[model samples]
Target: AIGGPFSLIRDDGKRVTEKNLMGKWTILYFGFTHCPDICPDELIKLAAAIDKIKENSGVDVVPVFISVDPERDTVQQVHEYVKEFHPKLIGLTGSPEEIKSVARSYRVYYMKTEEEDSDYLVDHSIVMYLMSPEMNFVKFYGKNHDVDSLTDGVVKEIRQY
Candidate 1:
């Protein structure tokens, strides 16, 4: 049981839960919109991998982005940031408590850097989660997985299962 239940708010202000993850393949990434570099780079890889997966395997994957910095990542902010990556990306944000709950459920590690100013960075685990149509945790791709490997790995998993 790697992932548990969670209720979060999407960019559209609609509520989303683990239930919505069912009936389709899903890729989940946790980060903040204000991330300086790594998060953006990973997101780029994720978007490209998704496109490649669809092109190569014709499998539609739901891309989900959850905000770890709830203090600054408002729904609108998340909405704008995710839209820049992919049209099908789903941006999710919620209260700090809600974020913590979901993060804990996924065993995600995230911490804000020590800074005095409002401009602070968050150090979070760089990983993407793959979920099956049954909403079960299938696999995870670490930072080392490039676009090609990630795309191929996802397609392989889909075919194998």
Candidate 2:
């Protein structure tokens, strides 16, 4: 549960800070675009859950993916990849230092398992981070969750808010 000021490069090459996320529930995930299978699968799950959340809540929750492998994850590449998974998805990439800084703020752990082959096979913690309208870490989710579970969890949180 980390909450503080942070900034990263959005797909449009614009800087998005904690200020931008304040005022709506936000979904945040950290993974690489080159990730062989898991990352894409996770995004699909995220999109499904998001659709359910929106349908029931009558409000929008921002879905964002931040690439840990900034080396190959350019802004344009991340833009195209995120859209393929979900129309509302926002993909982000930045410098190596920028990645490290934001990952720390989110308490995310990621590393390159091997660096000789294609993609370098990055290993990272997979979860959808749920942020409050105030930009705080409200909760997080894993690949095992489904749309009903995610939607309910978000609805419960909104009710409390």
Candidate 3:
């Protein structure tokens, strides 16, 4: 079970919480912008699923991108990075310690990979947590899940509430 809302800095440097997200279904993806391969592909799939959900259900879903590498991805950088994927995407970042705490709370596994001099990367589990309007974790989607399957799963789950 997921814990209570934790403090996080938004792309614009404002503090946000799960309380602020009340009444909205949130799709949370934990990753870094510097991720070369898996990150972009996962986000593209999420974008497509979001489009399908919006078109069919007309529900405004909140997509949140939380960076694992807080040292490299600042608030401004996160904002710029998220815009390349989707407009509704909210980018979140914080101090290294703060991010670690949040990651632990969510049971997300992330670690740095590659050499320090070159363009290093992070290897994080690519799983999207689907939160209900009440801020409860309703379901999760793996990387291989297709857009249609994701959309259908979300629609079915949300219809229960």
CA lDDT of every candidate: 0.92, 0.85, 0.87
lDDT by residue for model 1 (1-161), tens: 88899999999989999997789899999999988788889999999999999999999998899999999999999999999999999999999999999999999999989666647888898879999999999899999999999999999999998
The segments of candidate 3 whose C-alpha lies over 4 angstroms from its true place after superposition are none
What TM-score quantifies how close candidate 2 is to the native fold? 0.93
TM-score of each: 0.96, 0.93, 0.94
Cα-lDDT of candidate 2: 0.85
* Candidate 3 lDDT score at position 33: 84
Off by over 4 Å in 2: 115-119
Error of 2 at 152 (Å): 1.5
- lDDT-superior candidate, 2 or 3: 3
Candidate 3 lDDT, 70-112, residue by residue in tens: 9899998999999999988999899898888878888899998
Superpose all Cα atoms of candidate 1 onto the true structure and report the RMSD in Å to 1 decimal: 1.2
